[PDB]
Design a protein around this ligand. Structure first.
Ligand SMILES: O=C(O)CNC(=O)C(=O)O
Ligand SMILES: O=C(O)CNC(=O)C(=O)O
Ligand code: NI
Ligand code: NI
Lengths: 461, 11, 459, 11
C-alpha cells in the first residue's frame, strides 16, 4: 500500500516542470548514485549494479499479477504482444502458438519451462507508461521496455548483446546475471543486436551477480549478457531500453547528402568535371598503380570531403531528429495541476439532457504556457512551418502517424517564445503578433489541442 | 528461435 | 566524294588501338587547335569558335537528305524521336502531333517555320554512331547528339543553358549564334538545364558569330545560348553533348553514404551516442543561442566529417561509375582488322543445305588481346566478380539492361592482365591461371562473347 | 513551351 515508487510518483505530481520531473525520476531510478556521475563516467562505458537493499523499491510498477490480469482481460496475442522462449541445450527456442494468449496457454508454457516476455508493457500498464513517458524526456530518445518472467531452474534467453542502452529493474524473485565487456573493438557500442551466442564464444564476465527485487543493473549496447533462475524461485524484471540508433554517425548519415547537395549548389569546385581518364588509374584493378594522378585524385577527395563540414545543415537535421523523436514519443502524463489547468480538465459535461459549463473563452488577459516541455517541436519544411506534437500519440509505437499543425509566419515568433520560455506564464496580449486576432487564434488553437495551459482554469464548476 | 530485446514494443 | 571526315574515318580504320583512334578523332574534331591546349585551358572554362574555312569538313556525317530518307524509311515518331519547335514573339512552342512523323507532316511544319530536332541521330545513322562511339572513349562519359534543322528566317529555340558540354558542328547553311558567359556564380557549370529565358534576362554575348558548314562552336554547361537563321538559307547542325552529371560532387554523393557506414563499422567515435540534450541548443529555434555546447557540437560535426575522407571507398565508387558508363555506352565500331580477327568475322555461313567453315577452336598457342580498350570493366560486387561489357548495347540509350558475365576467382588475375595490357598479344597458354582448363575457358568465353581477338583468324 | 538539348537521345 506504500513503496518508494509510489512515493516518488506522488512527489513528481507536485513538481510543476516536466523537465524537472524527468531529472528527478532518473535520479530516483539510480539512487543513490548521482546522475551526473553516472552520465559522465558510466553511461556508454561500464556495466553498473545498484544494490538497493530494499525489496520494495519498485512496488506498484509491474507485477506478475498484473500480467495475469492482462492475459485474462486484454487481447494479448502471442508474437504481437507476448513471446514464450526457452534456452535449453545451448539452443534458443520460440514456442509461440499463433493467436490469443490466454492464461491457460501462457501458464502451461511457463510450467513447461518457458520464459514469458511482454513486448510493450506500457500499452497495458498506466504505471509503466508514466515511467517511460517521464524518462524519455531526459534521454532525448525513446524509452521502451520489455517485461521478462522466467520460471524456476531455467534460462529463457541465449547469451547475446542488444542494440540499446539497458536498465534491468529486478521486480520479483532472484536471477543470476552475467555481463561481459565488449569482446572486440567492433562490438563496443554495437549498432545492431547480435546473434544468439554459445558459451564457447564468451570470455570472462565483468559482472556476475544474483539480482534481487529493487536492484538495478545497467549495461551499454554491445555488452553481452545472460541470465538464469536457480534455487527454485522465479524472476520478473522489466528492461528499460533507450538510445536505439542515436549516434553521431546517424546524425552524419542524414547530414551528408544535404551537405553535398548544398556544396554543389553554392560552390563551383563541387560542380567541376571529373577527369576524362580517371578510370585509367582508379578502381580495384588499379589499387597498386604508381600513377601520381592516383595520389592526387585521393587527396582531392579528402580535401573536398573535409570542406563539407561548412555546408552541413546541422540545425535542420537536429529538427528532423526532434520531429522523429516527437513521433516515437509516448504521450504525456499530466500532473493533477496540468490537467486542471488545461482543456482536459474543463468541467464541461452532459447532465440531465444537456451539456453544462459551455463556453469560457481565452482573452488577452489569460496567462498561458506550454502544457509540458517535451511535447512539441516547431519544424520548417517546404518553406512552411509545422508544430509537431505528442499529445495524441498512442501508447503503441507508431500506431498513429505523425501529428502536426501549421503555424502561419505571423504566428511563428509567438510560438517560438512559448516553447523557449516554459514554464513562465505569458499574457496572450503580450505574445509577439501584430494583431489581437493572431494572439487569440494561436493561443486558442494551442489550448484546444491540449498544448497549452492557463494560470487559472478557464471554466469553473 | 530468435529475437532478444525489442525496444520498440513490436516484433 | 572524298572529304576530310571520310578521310579521317578511313584513317581511323588503320589505327590499331581504339584509345589512339579516340584521341585522333578528337584532334580532328577541333583541328587545328591542340587537344591538350583545349582541355587545359578551354574545356569547362570558355566558349570556343573554330572557323574551319572548309565547308566540306563534315561531309558524310549527316545531311538533311539523310533526315528525309529516315522519315520515309524508318518509323520516326513525334516526341519519341522528332520534335518540331518554334520560338516567335518570345515564346517557345512545341507542335508535335501525336504519332508517326511522315515527310508530309514534317515538311509542312518546316514550311510553317518550325525547327526539326532529331533526338537520337545515332540510332538511325551508322556514321553518327561511329562518331559518338569513338569519341565517348576519350571523354570517359557518354557522347550524345541531337540534330537541329531550322528553316530560313526563323528561330527554333529560346535562349537557355543546357546541362552538358556542347560541341556544335555546323553541317549545312548558316546560323547566327549568341553565346553568353554564366550570368552568376551559381550558373557557372550548372547541374541542370535552365528554363527558357527571355531577352530581358540576358546580358551581353561573349561570342556572336554566323556559323558556316565545317565550323565548330563549343561552350560549357551554364553558358546561355541562342541561334537564328537569317537571310534566306536554312541551317543544319549536329550538337555533340557529353559530361552529364559527371562532377566531383556526383562522385562524393556516392562516396559519402559508404564512407559514413564504414566509419560507423570501424570506429567507435562514430558509434557514440548523441548528447541527451542537444535538442535544447540545436535546431532552427536555437540558431542564435550562445550556449557553448552549440559551438562544440558544430566543431565535432566538422571534425567527424573531415575524418570521413579516410573511410571513403574511392576505387569501389570509381568502378560503379565505370559500370554505369559501360551501360550508357554505344556499342563499339570495329575496324576491318578487328572484325576479321574476331568472332564477328568467322567465315562460317550456310551454304547449299549446310553450315560451311566450322572454325578452329582456340588453343594454348593462340595469341589474343581485348577486342578494343573501352568495351569492358571488371567490377567486384557481393564477393563476386563481374565483367560488364558494351558489345551487346543498343544504339538507343539503355534500351537493353546492363550486360555482364561472371569471372570466377581462378580466372580473375588473367582477365585483369588482359584488360591492363591491351593491345599486346598474349599466348592463351601464358595467361595466369592455375590450369590449362581455365586458360582455355576464359579465352573461349571471351572470344564467343565478341570481347577478344586472335592474332590470326581462327579461320 | 518545351525542352532543349536531350543528351540522352530520349524523352
Ligand atoms: O532474462 C534474460 O534471460 C535475458 N534478458 C535480457 O536479455 C534483457 O533484459 O535485455
Ligand atoms: O539551334 C538552336 O536554336 C538550338 N540549339 C541548341 O540549343 C543546342 O544546340 O544546344
Ligand atoms: Ni538482452
Ligand atoms: Ni542548347
Amino acid at each position: 500500500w506504500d513503496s518508494p515508487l509510489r512515493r516518488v510518483l506522488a512527489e513528481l505530481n507536485r513538481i510543476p516542470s516536466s523537465r524537472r520531473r524527468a531529472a528527478r525520476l532518473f535520479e530516483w531510478l539510480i539512487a543513490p548514485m548521482p546522475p551526473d556521475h553516472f552520465y559522465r563516467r558510466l553511461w556508454e562505458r561500464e556495466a553498473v549494479l545498484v544494490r538497493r537493499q530494499d525489496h520494495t523499491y519498485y512496488q506498484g510498477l509491474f507485477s506478475t499479477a498484473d500480467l495475469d490480469s492482462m492475459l485474462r482481460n486484454e487481447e494479448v496475442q502471442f508474437g504481437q504482444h507476448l513471446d514464450a522462449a526457452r534456452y535449453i541445450n545451448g539452443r534458443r527456442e520460440t514456442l509461440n502458438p499463433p493467436g490469443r494468449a490466454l492464461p491457460a496457454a501462457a501458464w502451461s508454457l511457463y510450467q513447461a519451462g518457458c520464459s514469458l516476455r511482454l513486448l510493450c508493457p506500457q500499452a497495458f500498464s498506466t504505471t509503466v507508461w508514466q515511467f517511460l513517458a517521464v524518462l524519455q524526456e531526459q534521454f532525448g530518445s525513446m524509452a521502451g521496455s520489455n517485461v521478462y518472467l522466467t520460471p524456476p531452474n531455467s534460462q529463457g534467453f541465449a547469451p547475446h548483446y542488444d542494440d540499446i542502452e539497458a536498465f534491468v529493474l529486478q521486480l520479483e524473485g532472484r536471477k543470476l546475471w552475467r555481463v561481459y565487456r565488449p569482446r572486440v573493438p567492433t562490438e563496443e557500442l554495437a549498432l545492431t543486436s547480435s546473434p544468439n551466442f554459445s558459451q564457447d564464444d564468451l570470455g570472462e564476465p565483468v559482472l556476475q551477480t544474483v539480482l534481487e527485487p529493487g536492484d538495478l543493473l545497467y549495461f551499454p549496447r554491445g555488452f553481452i549478457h545472460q541470465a538464469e533462475c536457480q534455487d527454485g524461485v522465479h524472476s520478473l524484471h522489466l528492461t528499460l531500453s533507450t538510445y536505439q540508433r542515436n549516434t553521431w554517425g546517424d546524425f552524419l548519415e542524414a547530414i551528408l547528402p544535404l551537405a553535398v547537395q548544398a556544396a554543389m549548389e553554392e560552390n563551383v569546385e563541387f560542380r567541376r568535371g571529373l577527369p576524362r581518364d580517371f578510370m585509367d588509374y582508379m578502381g580495384a584493378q588499379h589499387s597498386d598503380s604508381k600513377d601520381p594522378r592516383r595520389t592526387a585524385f585521393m587527396e582531392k577527395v579528402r580535401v573536398l570531403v573535409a570542406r563539407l563540414g561548412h555546408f552541413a545543415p546541422v540545425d535542420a537535421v537536429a529538427d528532423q531528429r526532434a520531429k522523429d523523436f516527437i513521433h516515437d514519443s509516448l504521450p504525456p502524463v499530466l500532473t493533477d495541476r496540468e490537467r486542471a489547468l488545461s482543456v482536459y480538465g474543463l468541467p464541461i459535461r452532459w447532465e440531465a439532457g444537456e451539456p453544462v459549463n459551455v463556453g469560457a473563452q481565452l482573452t488577452t488577459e489569460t496567462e498561458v504556457h506550454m502544457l509540458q516541455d517535451g511535447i512539441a517541436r516547431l519544424v520548417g519544411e517546404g518553406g512552411h512551418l509545422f508544430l509537431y506534437y505528442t499529445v495524441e500519440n498512442s501508447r503503441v509505437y507508431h500506431l498513429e502517424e505523425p501529428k502536426c499543425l501549421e503555424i502561419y509566419p505571423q504566428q511563428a515568433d509567438a510560438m517560438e517564445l512559448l516553447l523557449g520560455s516554459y514554464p513562465e506564464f505569458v499574457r496572450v496580449g503580450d505574445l509577439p503578433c501584430d494583431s489581437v486576432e493572431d494572439q487569440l487564434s494561436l493561443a486558442t488553437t494551442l489550448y484546444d489541442k491540449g498544448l497549452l495551459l492557463t494560470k487559472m482554469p478557464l471554466a469553473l464548476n | 528461435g530468435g529475437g532478444n530485446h525489442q525496444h520498440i514494443g513490436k516484433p
